[PDB]
């Protein structure tokens, strides 16, 4: 009653985090572990997390897209929800872009592919999978 997978507006899948943390797009909302949750610390950026196993998302110190496991700042997010919907999500601190989040494809997401503040990569639909 707190998870939600990320899903996106680019073809409509789930982020999640398989094994490595590997971010990617699954349709399955039923997957017993694609779940994610949305929710930020303080400022316009956030922390997501990966699965209900209370972990969280965060750029591959490069510009890949990975589960996040530890705080800091590396591991935080953006915050933009247009009207009221879906989110924006992947960053850090700073604004840039250039490592937005996005999701599509099949499964594996969007690693920083052309992110830009309102791309669907970025914009992504919560929701309140959770179980009931």
Same mark, same amino acid.
């Given at each position: 009653?707190?998870?939600?997978? &990320?899903?996106?507006?680019?073809? %409509?899948?789930? &982020? ?5 943390? !590997?971010?990617?797009? #699954? ?21 997501? !997390?990966?699965?209900? #196993? ?10 890949? &897209? ?12 953006? +915050?933009?929800?247009? +009207? ?17 989040? %996005?999701? !599509?494809?099949?499964? !594996? #997401?969007?690693?920083?592919?052309? #992110? ?8 992504? &639909? ?7």
């Amino acid at each position: 009653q707190k998870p939600k997978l &990320l899903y996106c507006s680019n073809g %409509g899948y789930f &982020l999640r985090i398989f094994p490595d943390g !590997k971010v990617d797009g #699954t349709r399955d909302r039923s997957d017993p572990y694609i779940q994610l949750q949305f929710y930020a610390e303080s400022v316009g950026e956030v922390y997501i !997390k990966s699965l209900e #196993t209370g972990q969280y998302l965060a750029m591959d110190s490069d510009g890949q &897209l990975y589960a996040s496991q530890s705080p800091s700042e590396e591991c935080l997010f953006l +915050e933009r929800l247009e +009207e009221n919907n879906y989110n924006t999500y992947k960053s850090k601190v700073h604004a840039d872009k250039d490592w937005f989040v %996005g999701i !599509k494809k099949n499964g !594996k #997401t969007k690693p920083g592919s052309r #992110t830009h503040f309102g791309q669907k990569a970025i914009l992504f &639909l919560p929701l309140p999978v959770s179980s009931d």
